[PDB]
Amino acid sequence: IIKGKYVINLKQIAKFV
Amino acid sequence: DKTENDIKALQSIGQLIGEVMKELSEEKYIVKASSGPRYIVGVRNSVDRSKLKKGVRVTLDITTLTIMRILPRETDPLVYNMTSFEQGEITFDGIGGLTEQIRELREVIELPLKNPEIFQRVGIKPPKGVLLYGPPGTGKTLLAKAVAATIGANFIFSPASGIVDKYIGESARIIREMFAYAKEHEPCIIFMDEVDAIGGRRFSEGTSADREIQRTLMELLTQMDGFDNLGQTKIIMATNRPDTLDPALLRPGRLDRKVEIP
Amino acid sequence: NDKVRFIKDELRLLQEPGSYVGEVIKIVSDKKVLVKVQPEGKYIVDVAKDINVKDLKASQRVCLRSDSYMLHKVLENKADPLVSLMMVEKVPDSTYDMVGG
Amino acid sequence: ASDESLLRYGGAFTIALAYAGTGNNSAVKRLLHVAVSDSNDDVRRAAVIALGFVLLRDYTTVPRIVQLLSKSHNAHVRCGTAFALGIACAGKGLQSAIDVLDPLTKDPVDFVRQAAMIALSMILIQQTEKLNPQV
Amino acid sequence: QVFDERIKFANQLHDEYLVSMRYPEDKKTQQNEK
Amino acid sequence: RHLKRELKRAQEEVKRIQSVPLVIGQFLEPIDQNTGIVSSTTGMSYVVRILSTLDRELLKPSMSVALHRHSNALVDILPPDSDSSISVMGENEKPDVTYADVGGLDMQKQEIREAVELPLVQADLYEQIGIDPPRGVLLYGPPGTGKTMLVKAVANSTKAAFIRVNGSEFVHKYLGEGPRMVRDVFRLARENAPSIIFIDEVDSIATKRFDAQT
Amino acid sequence: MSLQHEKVTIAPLVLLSALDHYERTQTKENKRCVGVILGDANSSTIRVTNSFALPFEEDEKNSDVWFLDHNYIENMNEMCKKINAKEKLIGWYHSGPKLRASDLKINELFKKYTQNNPLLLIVDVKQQGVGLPTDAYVAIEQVKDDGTSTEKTFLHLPCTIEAEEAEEIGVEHLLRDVRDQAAGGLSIRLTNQLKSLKGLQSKLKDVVEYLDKVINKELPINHTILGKLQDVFNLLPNLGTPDDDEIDVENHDRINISNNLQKALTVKTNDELMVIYISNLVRSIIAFDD
Amino acid sequence: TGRDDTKETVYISSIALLKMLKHGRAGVPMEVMGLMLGEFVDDYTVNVVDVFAMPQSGTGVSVEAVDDVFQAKMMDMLKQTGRDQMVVGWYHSHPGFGCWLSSVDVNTQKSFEQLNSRAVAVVVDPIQSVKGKVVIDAFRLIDTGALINNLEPRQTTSNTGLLNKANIQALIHGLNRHYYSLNIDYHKTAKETKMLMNLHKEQWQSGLKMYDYEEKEESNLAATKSMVKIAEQYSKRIEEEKELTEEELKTRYVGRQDPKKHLSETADETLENNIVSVLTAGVNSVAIK
Amino acid sequence: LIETVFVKNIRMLSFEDISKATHLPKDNVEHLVMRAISLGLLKGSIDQVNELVTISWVQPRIISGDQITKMKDRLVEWNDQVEKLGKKMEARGQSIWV
Amino acid sequence: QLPYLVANVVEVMDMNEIEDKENSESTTQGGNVNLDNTAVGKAAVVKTSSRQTVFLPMVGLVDPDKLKPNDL
Ligand SMILES: Nc1ncnc2c1ncn2[C@@H]1O[C@H](COP(=O)(O)OP(=O)(O)OP(=O)(O)O)[C@@H](O)[C@H]1O
Ligand SMILES: Nc1ncnc2c1ncn2[C@@H]1O[C@H](COP(=O)(O)OP(=O)(O)OP(=O)(O)O)[C@@H](O)[C@H]1O
Ligand SMILES: [Mg+2]
Ligand SMILES: [Mg+2]
């Protein structure tokens, strides 16, 4: 959690914002 | 200007790395891309045949697949951490009263560094290979930091367990490629810190982790002795008990001096 | 003419979408086949008009047209698992004239 | 001599209608030239069709001329071959005309098949099947 | 000059075969067969 | 005349599909002389048409090959020499140890001159007597004994081709990488036969026990 | 500024573009068209990627009087900068039949925008000649040995054409022709041979009558023109030398391979000769049962 | 009804095709966009004269990525020189997919169709034009309400009936059943044909350009050596191969992988090259001196 | 020395012609030639056994009214020479100009 | 604005900056005058979590002070 977007890492390992 | 350089950047596309695996004809090359599958690619007149040679990282295009230009070699992201942690620094003297062992260590390391020519006169193989073992807390590591600090020779390092990876053929990759680094960087000194991780024996009647150790261990032997021979790459191996290890990591001429600090 | 119109025809023939090797795990009697693609996983997929599930059987390799994985032909191959073990061990057979005495 | 596809398409048929039903080598000669030597498909087709009009007066020789053209596997060339045979050998049939069209009926290209079925019916027009089994 | 006289013998053989090769083939395909 | 002309044009077209870029697969085995089974090294198996007027004498046994990128067809073939795992390490490298390190280890010296050197100098010595040749050599013992030293020593002596491979040069890094590396090294050996293939260690590669639950 | 214009590669896109703009202003009867040239510089090869028309009205009373919109130029450039940001002013194309000395003053005007030396690319819209419809020139300053001060003058640049991989295949898609200048098969290189020789014969005829015009009709004398002819005479081949005798010997060698290969194909065809005749015998049996 | 009501056959000029490809190729892998400028005559003849690209985005092709500023202003540039016409449609690039409209672009085509109902969308593959063949296809939406009214046969009336396909099951569904395809032809004048056909000023004078003789001796040497080995291959083939069933014999006694054909091919090839080499040398010696 | 080679269509000179022009012995013709090479005003090599100076390269220099006429005639000879020869090449290979 | 890939930096291995007359690179190339012809500015190699590496020209707004040879 980035305070005022988020970082997810998928199960397809592949990281996106 | 700050935003106009970004326009020039956004309209540029990326490039995909490979390396020259094999010359095919004159204009055709086998590359092994870092995507992984090999391709056949072209040349611009920017490169020449004699600037290409095997094992050179070359760029490719991603829609033309032509070598535009030669690139210097890849270098792991991991190993820059190791070249930028030496802190905990201290002078020639890192202990007092065990100076006799400090003097002994530099015999193996520091002396062939300065003059190979005095080991010519004798006719021995230039010394290399060091095992450090002893009771814990006795400055075996602080001496490691001191001989990287004092001489200032190129140092890497490896914690016993930050070279261990989940992917296999990836924990081989680092340490193979770490020795490579050691041959372009001058007189290098490889400190293995607190190795008991891959110190393990043949086991593999236990879990799969014991074959993971095995895979990584075989990798070392071929480097230590073979057609690949060292001379200005030195091993300092730090451990807290040496009878954990496999005896092929107790093997002299890879470990020529076994210095104990009591 | 036979020559030049064979080249011109081969240019079309060579253009594919990709055509795979699959192997039949098992059929289902909806007129579909469960096929495990050898690298990939399993997909139940229909069959062509030149084959049906009675022409198909477990452990027989098929050809797939891979945009839906629509069965094209049986393959000209068939795997056998018992030979896998026997070969990898690798032992011959004999007569009694190689044991005599 | 026009490089337009359009004016060359009609160019063939001005020879055809100018020399229609005339036993002239030059009239026929020109059409043969266009078919082979031109690299636009529609223009290749038009040259073949035109042949039957010049050689209405004598259509005995016609199937042999286009025998060559049916060997060629371009859809348009075979397509215009079908029509030339229908045109020239209409009325009471000719055995050679029938033969050349048969492979063109079974062609793997729809455009040649559509042309061929029609051409046959002109050759065999209102012929009873008790007078010829092939009909 | 020597090579050319040899090439002319080679060219003579090239003409001779071309003419005669198809000629028995054309009569034989004329004549009926299965 | 016009067909001879469009034959040229058609042959020109088919060279364009022979050309770059190309992806490299592996040929498994045929099912036809114009259709084959290939495993791309993308980790995908394909059944692909084959181009006519290629040679197939080297193709039908496993060998590197060129396939086209987007369509994935067999459009050209490669020679087995190129696309090696690693090139010869006995002509572009030279052993760094000779038999002047060898004093003793004579017991093994009588057994290794039989095993390695005699089929290199002439294979037919065995055949005429009627002795069939021995196969590979296993050296075992603690590695401090000079097992490899002996390999370098007689390699420098016989001066035949030599290949330096290891299991960390066969090791998997992506899908389908490892098996491919295996096939290449023998292919090269046979091409410039006779040859010696040296794998320094097979400890990792082979293990008496396996899990095979993972 | 500098000379880096040694090669000018020109995209085929630009030539096609030039004719399109020329007609869509419909400049005829000795009217001109000028548009900007966009592309790379600071490279020995000058890459002509793109062009765009500028509004430019050229007078008919004089050649010294023209209208050109300076404000227009920046707007066209900033837009195209958004598309691809490797495009800058590298010159301007003139579309006249040939070269003028009122283009020199225009050249100076475009020197303001450039950071290179302006390329004048006379794109011919008359398609004259079987060779390139492009001559290229760059305006350069010289002094000369005559006593002439501070000249500005145009030095010819050899013209070449390159195309990108995507660009080239578009041509191939559009066209299917086989090209009277092609060096393909045996009949095609035979035609190229006689065509190439007569190409030289034409140019040499011009020089001979050009020399007369200097020395009876008082065309100007220039040391660049005389110096080039000197080079021809000095590096001219010679026969009857030991070079000539080795040529003849190399010549027998090539005649030797030809003679071997002529014999080789007679064997193959004579094999076919037999096999047609065996097939006849078999088909006779078949015909008799039939 | 009352018109031909069929999708234009898009005639893309000599300039345009190249321009779209150059535009798209640079941006690979990211998607590209732009407008087609053209003119509309017959009920089914749109000649596309020129193109211009609409600048890049950080989210690729969107309806959002249309910017009225760029579009109108760039139009006003052409206006001053009188080479603008009217927007006949737009192009965009899917280099990661085959020729067919993605989910987004259909809604973009909807908006474009509102403005002008002859609006086409042309999908360019700059990544499958590394072949000798350029992969390019044209589509125009047929509305959903239009499929309900079953007006689809109206759009195929008075055509040759020849349409294009691209891969099966997902690509082909969208193709025939939600939009309509018409072929693409290429338009040119005889002035432009001469411009393309020309090459260097020493390309019609390249037959006097002999080569180094070291290279020509390489050619002489390689051919003669290789043919000895294929001849050996040819000897083995004709020892047997005289029992029954031709294909069998050809499989048994290598007759497939035909050395008879290969040998003749090489001989002819080297034979044609050497007659011109001899001819070149005989000219240049005697003609120059 | 530079003058005599350039104006002539021959590029080989017996020392006898040079000796009589420059009023030198054979000793000094050999130096003169050698110096021309060192400075780079001529380049070539010497046969003192054939007794020729075979010059192979002449420096370009200013070209005056008289020389242009010499230069011109040389170009007429070669121009006519291609033209007569091209007729044979038109006549030979008539069948194929395709 | 979203979405974008998240990666780490292999290394910054810069090329010399663009002010020169012959190339602006650290690795010698064939041929002469070049400044943007195949020449490029500073270089960043980044490794994805889709598992490759790409040689990209680094953005001219992001500094080498904002880049470490491990930076995320
Ligand atoms: N002889 C010494 N004199 C002063 N400080 C020392 C001495 N040796 C060790 N230390 C201190 O102890 C700390 C940790 O010991 P260090 O990591 O260097 O030793 P070690 O013998 O390898 O054992 P381990 O690896 O288990 O830590 C140092 O950072 C330092 O402050
Ligand atoms: N008989 C001998 N003469 C001289 N030196 C020897 C002798 N035997 C061994 N040595 C030396 O001992 C070292 C090891 O030998 P070698 O290089 O053959 O590896 P190895 O035993 O197979 O080890 P590993 O396979 O684990 O890598 C070498 O430096 C070698 O020269
Ligand atoms: Mg420690
Ligand atoms: Mg060893």
JSON list of N, CA, C and O in Angstrom, two decimals, chain B residues 130-165:
[
{"chain": "B", "resi": 130, "resn": "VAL", "atom": "N", "xyz": [42.49, -20.75, 0.77]},
{"chain": "B", "resi": 130, "resn": "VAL", "atom": "CA", "xyz": [42.63, -20.61, 2.21]},
{"chain": "B", "resi": 130, "resn": "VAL", "atom": "C", "xyz": [41.37, -21.10, 2.88]},
{"chain": "B", "resi": 130, "resn": "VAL", "atom": "O", "xyz": [40.26, -20.72, 2.49]},
{"chain": "B", "resi": 131, "resn": "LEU", "atom": "N", "xyz": [41.54, -21.93, 3.90]},
{"chain": "B", "resi": 131, "resn": "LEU", "atom": "CA", "xyz": [40.49, -22.29, 4.82]},
{"chain": "B", "resi": 131, "resn": "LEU", "atom": "C", "xyz": [40.74, -21.61, 6.14]},
{"chain": "B", "resi": 131, "resn": "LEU", "atom": "O", "xyz": [41.82, -21.75, 6.72]},
{"chain": "B", "resi": 132, "resn": "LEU", "atom": "N", "xyz": [39.74, -20.89, 6.63]},
{"chain": "B", "resi": 132, "resn": "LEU", "atom": "CA", "xyz": [39.77, -20.37, 7.98]},
{"chain": "B", "resi": 132, "resn": "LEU", "atom": "C", "xyz": [38.73, -21.11, 8.80]},
{"chain": "B", "resi": 132, "resn": "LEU", "atom": "O", "xyz": [37.58, -21.24, 8.38]},
{"chain": "B", "resi": 133, "resn": "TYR", "atom": "N", "xyz": [39.16, -21.59, 9.95]},
{"chain": "B", "resi": 133, "resn": "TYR", "atom": "CA", "xyz": [38.29, -22.36, 10.81]},
{"chain": "B", "resi": 133, "resn": "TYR", "atom": "C", "xyz": [38.77, -22.15, 12.23]},
{"chain": "B", "resi": 133, "resn": "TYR", "atom": "O", "xyz": [39.97, -21.98, 12.48]},
{"chain": "B", "resi": 134, "resn": "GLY", "atom": "N", "xyz": [37.83, -22.17, 13.16]},
{"chain": "B", "resi": 134, "resn": "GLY", "atom": "CA", "xyz": [38.17, -22.00, 14.54]},
{"chain": "B", "resi": 134, "resn": "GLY", "atom": "C", "xyz": [36.96, -21.79, 15.41]},
{"chain": "B", "resi": 134, "resn": "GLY", "atom": "O", "xyz": [35.81, -21.85, 14.96]},
{"chain": "B", "resi": 135, "resn": "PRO", "atom": "N", "xyz": [37.21, -21.54, 16.68]},
{"chain": "B", "resi": 135, "resn": "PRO", "atom": "CA", "xyz": [36.12, -21.23, 17.61]},
{"chain": "B", "resi": 135, "resn": "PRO", "atom": "C", "xyz": [35.49, -19.89, 17.26]},
{"chain": "B", "resi": 135, "resn": "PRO", "atom": "O", "xyz": [36.13, -19.05, 16.61]},
{"chain": "B", "resi": 136, "resn": "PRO", "atom": "N", "xyz": [34.24, -19.66, 17.67]},
{"chain": "B", "resi": 136, "resn": "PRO", "atom": "CA", "xyz": [33.48, -18.53, 17.12]},
{"chain": "B", "resi": 136, "resn": "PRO", "atom": "C", "xyz": [33.74, -17.21, 17.82]},
{"chain": "B", "resi": 136, "resn": "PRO", "atom": "O", "xyz": [33.92, -17.13, 19.03]},
{"chain": "B", "resi": 137, "resn": "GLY", "atom": "N", "xyz": [33.73, -16.14, 17.02]},
{"chain": "B", "resi": 137, "resn": "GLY", "atom": "CA", "xyz": [33.94, -14.81, 17.52]},
{"chain": "B", "resi": 137, "resn": "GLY", "atom": "C", "xyz": [35.38, -14.39, 17.58]},
{"chain": "B", "resi": 137, "resn": "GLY", "atom": "O", "xyz": [35.69, -13.38, 18.22]},
{"chain": "B", "resi": 138, "resn": "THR", "atom": "N", "xyz": [36.27, -15.11, 16.90]},
{"chain": "B", "resi": 138, "resn": "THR", "atom": "CA", "xyz": [37.71, -14.96, 17.07]},
{"chain": "B", "resi": 138, "resn": "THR", "atom": "C", "xyz": [38.32, -14.10, 15.97]},
{"chain": "B", "resi": 138, "resn": "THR", "atom": "O", "xyz": [39.53, -14.19, 15.72]},
{"chain": "B", "resi": 139, "resn": "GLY", "atom": "N", "xyz": [37.52, -13.27, 15.31]},
{"chain": "B", "resi": 139, "resn": "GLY", "atom": "CA", "xyz": [38.04, -12.33, 14.35]},
{"chain": "B", "resi": 139, "resn": "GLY", "atom": "C", "xyz": [38.40, -12.94, 13.02]},
{"chain": "B", "resi": 139, "resn": "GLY", "atom": "O", "xyz": [39.04, -12.28, 12.20]},
{"chain": "B", "resi": 140, "resn": "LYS", "atom": "N", "xyz": [37.99, -14.18, 12.77]},
{"chain": "B", "resi": 140, "resn": "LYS", "atom": "CA", "xyz": [38.15, -14.73, 11.44]},
{"chain": "B", "resi": 140, "resn": "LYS", "atom": "C", "xyz": [37.43, -13.86, 10.43]},
{"chain": "B", "resi": 140, "resn": "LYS", "atom": "O", "xyz": [37.96, -13.55, 9.36]},
{"chain": "B", "resi": 141, "resn": "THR", "atom": "N", "xyz": [36.21, -13.28, 10.64]},
{"chain": "B", "resi": 141, "resn": "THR", "atom": "CA", "xyz": [35.59, -12.40, 9.69]},
{"chain": "B", "resi": 141, "resn": "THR", "atom": "C", "xyz": [36.06, -10.98, 9.64]},
{"chain": "B", "resi": 141, "resn": "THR", "atom": "O", "xyz": [36.06, -10.32, 8.61]},
{"chain": "B", "resi": 142, "resn": "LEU", "atom": "N", "xyz": [36.51, -10.50, 10.84]},
{"chain": "B", "resi": 142, "resn": "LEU", "atom": "CA", "xyz": [36.98, -9.16, 10.92]},
{"chain": "B", "resi": 142, "resn": "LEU", "atom": "C", "xyz": [38.34, -9.02, 10.22]},
{"chain": "B", "resi": 142, "resn": "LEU", "atom": "O", "xyz": [38.59, -7.96, 9.56]},
{"chain": "B", "resi": 143, "resn": "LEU", "atom": "N", "xyz": [39.13, -10.16, 10.23]},
{"chain": "B", "resi": 143, "resn": "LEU", "atom": "CA", "xyz": [40.33, -10.26, 9.43]},
{"chain": "B", "resi": 143, "resn": "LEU", "atom": "C", "xyz": [40.07, -10.27, 7.96]},
{"chain": "B", "resi": 143, "resn": "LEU", "atom": "O", "xyz": [40.83, -9.68, 7.19]},
{"chain": "B", "resi": 144, "resn": "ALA", "atom": "N", "xyz": [38.90, -10.89, 7.53]},
{"chain": "B", "resi": 144, "resn": "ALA", "atom": "CA", "xyz": [38.45, -10.88, 6.15]},
{"chain": "B", "resi": 144, "resn": "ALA", "atom": "C", "xyz": [38.17, -9.47, 5.68]},
{"chain": "B", "resi": 144, "resn": "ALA", "atom": "O", "xyz": [38.59, -9.07, 4.59]},
{"chain": "B", "resi": 145, "resn": "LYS", "atom": "N", "xyz": [37.49, -8.69, 6.52]},
{"chain": "B", "resi": 145, "resn": "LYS", "atom": "CA", "xyz": [37.24, -7.30, 6.17]},
{"chain": "B", "resi": 145, "resn": "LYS", "atom": "C", "xyz": [38.54, -6.51, 6.15]},
{"chain": "B", "resi": 145, "resn": "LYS", "atom": "O", "xyz": [38.65, -5.53, 5.40]},
{"chain": "B", "resi": 146, "resn": "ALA", "atom": "N", "xyz": [39.52, -6.92, 6.94]},
{"chain": "B", "resi": 146, "resn": "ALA", "atom": "CA", "xyz": [40.75, -6.15, 7.05]},
{"chain": "B", "resi": 146, "resn": "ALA", "atom": "C", "xyz": [41.65, -6.35, 5.85]},
{"chain": "B", "resi": 146, "resn": "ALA", "atom": "O", "xyz": [42.35, -5.42, 5.44]},
{"chain": "B", "resi": 147, "resn": "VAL", "atom": "N", "xyz": [41.66, -7.55, 5.27]},
{"chain": "B", "resi": 147, "resn": "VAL", "atom": "CA", "xyz": [42.53, -7.81, 4.13]},
{"chain": "B", "resi": 147, "resn": "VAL", "atom": "C", "xyz": [41.91, -7.31, 2.84]},
{"chain": "B", "resi": 147, "resn": "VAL", "atom": "O", "xyz": [42.61, -7.15, 1.83]},
{"chain": "B", "resi": 148, "resn": "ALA", "atom": "N", "xyz": [40.60, -7.05, 2.84]},
{"chain": "B", "resi": 148, "resn": "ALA", "atom": "CA", "xyz": [39.99, -6.34, 1.73]},
{"chain": "B", "resi": 148, "resn": "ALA", "atom": "C", "xyz": [40.22, -4.85, 1.88]},
{"chain": "B", "resi": 148, "resn": "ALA", "atom": "O", "xyz": [40.45, -4.15, 0.88]},
{"chain": "B", "resi": 149, "resn": "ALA", "atom": "N", "xyz": [40.18, -4.37, 3.11]},
{"chain": "B", "resi": 149, "resn": "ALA", "atom": "CA", "xyz": [40.42, -2.96, 3.37]},
{"chain": "B", "resi": 149, "resn": "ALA", "atom": "C", "xyz": [41.89, -2.61, 3.14]},
{"chain": "B", "resi": 149, "resn": "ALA", "atom": "O", "xyz": [42.20, -1.68, 2.39]},
{"chain": "B", "resi": 150, "resn": "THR", "atom": "N", "xyz": [42.79, -3.35, 3.77]},
{"chain": "B", "resi": 150, "resn": "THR", "atom": "CA", "xyz": [44.19, -2.93, 3.79]},
{"chain": "B", "resi": 150, "resn": "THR", "atom": "C", "xyz": [44.78, -2.94, 2.39]},
{"chain": "B", "resi": 150, "resn": "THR", "atom": "O", "xyz": [45.28, -1.92, 1.91]},
{"chain": "B", "resi": 151, "resn": "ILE", "atom": "N", "xyz": [44.72, -4.08, 1.71]},
{"chain": "B", "resi": 151, "resn": "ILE", "atom": "CA", "xyz": [45.27, -4.14, 0.36]},
{"chain": "B", "resi": 151, "resn": "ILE", "atom": "C", "xyz": [44.46, -3.26, -0.57]},
{"chain": "B", "resi": 151, "resn": "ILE", "atom": "O", "xyz": [45.00, -2.48, -1.37]},
{"chain": "B", "resi": 152, "resn": "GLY", "atom": "N", "xyz": [43.14, -3.36, -0.47]},
{"chain": "B", "resi": 152, "resn": "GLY", "atom": "CA", "xyz": [42.28, -2.69, -1.42]},
{"chain": "B", "resi": 152, "resn": "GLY", "atom": "C", "xyz": [42.17, -3.42, -2.74]},
{"chain": "B", "resi": 152, "resn": "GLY", "atom": "O", "xyz": [41.86, -2.80, -3.76]},
{"chain": "B", "resi": 153, "resn": "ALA", "atom": "N", "xyz": [42.42, -4.73, -2.74]},
{"chain": "B", "resi": 153, "resn": "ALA", "atom": "CA", "xyz": [42.21, -5.50, -3.95]},
{"chain": "B", "resi": 153, "resn": "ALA", "atom": "C", "xyz": [40.73, -5.75, -4.15]},
{"chain": "B", "resi": 153, "resn": "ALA", "atom": "O", "xyz": [39.93, -5.66, -3.21]},
{"chain": "B", "resi": 154, "resn": "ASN", "atom": "N", "xyz": [40.35, -6.06, -5.38]},
{"chain": "B", "resi": 154, "resn": "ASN", "atom": "CA", "xyz": [38.94, -6.19, -5.66]},
{"chain": "B", "resi": 154, "resn": "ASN", "atom": "C", "xyz": [38.38, -7.32, -4.82]},
{"chain": "B", "resi": 154, "resn": "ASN", "atom": "O", "xyz": [38.96, -8.41, -4.75]},
{"chain": "B", "resi": 155, "resn": "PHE", "atom": "N", "xyz": [37.27, -7.05, -4.17]},
{"chain": "B", "resi": 155, "resn": "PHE", "atom": "CA", "xyz": [36.68, -8.00, -3.26]},
{"chain": "B", "resi": 155, "resn": "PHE", "atom": "C", "xyz": [35.26, -8.28, -3.68]},
{"chain": "B", "resi": 155, "resn": "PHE", "atom": "O", "xyz": [34.48, -7.35, -3.93]},
{"chain": "B", "resi": 156, "resn": "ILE", "atom": "N", "xyz": [34.94, -9.55, -3.74]},
{"chain": "B", "resi": 156, "resn": "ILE", "atom": "CA", "xyz": [33.60, -9.99, -3.46]},
{"chain": "B", "resi": 156, "resn": "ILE", "atom": "C", "xyz": [33.82, -11.01, -2.37]},
{"chain": "B", "resi": 156, "resn": "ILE", "atom": "O", "xyz": [34.90, -11.11, -1.78]},
{"chain": "B", "resi": 157, "resn": "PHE", "atom": "N", "xyz": [32.80, -11.79, -2.16]},
{"chain": "B", "resi": 157, "resn": "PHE", "atom": "CA", "xyz": [32.16, -11.99, -0.89]},
{"chain": "B", "resi": 157, "resn": "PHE", "atom": "C", "xyz": [31.13, -13.01, -1.28]},
{"chain": "B", "resi": 157, "resn": "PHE", "atom": "O", "xyz": [30.88, -13.22, -2.47]},
{"chain": "B", "resi": 158, "resn": "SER", "atom": "N", "xyz": [30.58, -13.66, -0.34]},
{"chain": "B", "resi": 158, "resn": "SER", "atom": "CA", "xyz": [29.32, -14.28, -0.62]},
{"chain": "B", "resi": 158, "resn": "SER", "atom": "C", "xyz": [28.87, -14.69, 0.76]},
{"chain": "B", "resi": 158, "resn": "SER", "atom": "O", "xyz": [29.63, -15.36, 1.47]},
{"chain": "B", "resi": 159, "resn": "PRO", "atom": "N", "xyz": [27.68, -14.32, 1.19]},
{"chain": "B", "resi": 159, "resn": "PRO", "atom": "CA", "xyz": [27.13, -15.00, 2.34]},
{"chain": "B", "resi": 159, "resn": "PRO", "atom": "C", "xyz": [26.70, -16.38, 1.90]},
{"chain": "B", "resi": 159, "resn": "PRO", "atom": "O", "xyz": [26.30, -16.61, 0.76]},
{"chain": "B", "resi": 160, "resn": "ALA", "atom": "N", "xyz": [26.81, -17.32, 2.82]},
{"chain": "B", "resi": 160, "resn": "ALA", "atom": "CA", "xyz": [26.57, -18.70, 2.47]},
{"chain": "B", "resi": 160, "resn": "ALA", "atom": "C", "xyz": [25.18, -18.92, 1.90]},
{"chain": "B", "resi": 160, "resn": "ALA", "atom": "O", "xyz": [24.92, -19.97, 1.30]},
{"chain": "B", "resi": 161, "resn": "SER", "atom": "N", "xyz": [24.29, -17.94, 2.04]},
{"chain": "B", "resi": 161, "resn": "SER", "atom": "CA", "xyz": [22.87, -18.21, 1.82]},
{"chain": "B", "resi": 161, "resn": "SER", "atom": "C", "xyz": [22.18, -17.09, 1.05]},
{"chain": "B", "resi": 161, "resn": "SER", "atom": "O", "xyz": [20.94, -17.09, 0.99]},
{"chain": "B", "resi": 162, "resn": "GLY", "atom": "N", "xyz": [22.92, -16.16, 0.47]},
{"chain": "B", "resi": 162, "resn": "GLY", "atom": "CA", "xyz": [22.33, -15.16, -0.41]},
{"chain": "B", "resi": 162, "resn": "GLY", "atom": "C", "xyz": [22.70, -15.47, -1.84]},
{"chain": "B", "resi": 162, "resn": "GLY", "atom": "O", "xyz": [22.27, -14.79, -2.78]},
{"chain": "B", "resi": 163, "resn": "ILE", "atom": "N", "xyz": [23.50, -16.52, -2.00]},
{"chain": "B", "resi": 163, "resn": "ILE", "atom": "CA", "xyz": [23.79, -17.11, -3.31]},
{"chain": "B", "resi": 163, "resn": "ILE", "atom": "C", "xyz": [22.88, -18.29, -3.58]},
{"chain": "B", "resi": 163, "resn": "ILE", "atom": "O", "xyz": [22.86, -18.80, -4.71]},
{"chain": "B", "resi": 164, "resn": "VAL", "atom": "N", "xyz": [22.16, -18.75, -2.57]},
{"chain": "B", "resi": 164, "resn": "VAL", "atom": "CA", "xyz": [21.19, -19.83, -2.72]},
{"chain": "B", "resi": 164, "resn": "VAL", "atom": "C", "xyz": [19.89, -19.26, -3.27]},
{"chain": "B", "resi": 164, "resn": "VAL", "atom": "O", "xyz": [19.38, -18.25, -2.75]},
{"chain": "B", "resi": 165, "resn": "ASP", "atom": "N", "xyz": [19.35, -19.89, -4.30]},
{"chain": "B", "resi": 165, "resn": "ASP", "atom": "CA", "xyz": [18.17, -19.41, -4.99]},
{"chain": "B", "resi": 165, "resn": "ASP", "atom": "C", "xyz": [17.08, -20.47, -4.98]},
{"chain": "B", "resi": 165, "resn": "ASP", "atom": "O", "xyz": [17.32, -21.65, -4.71]}
]
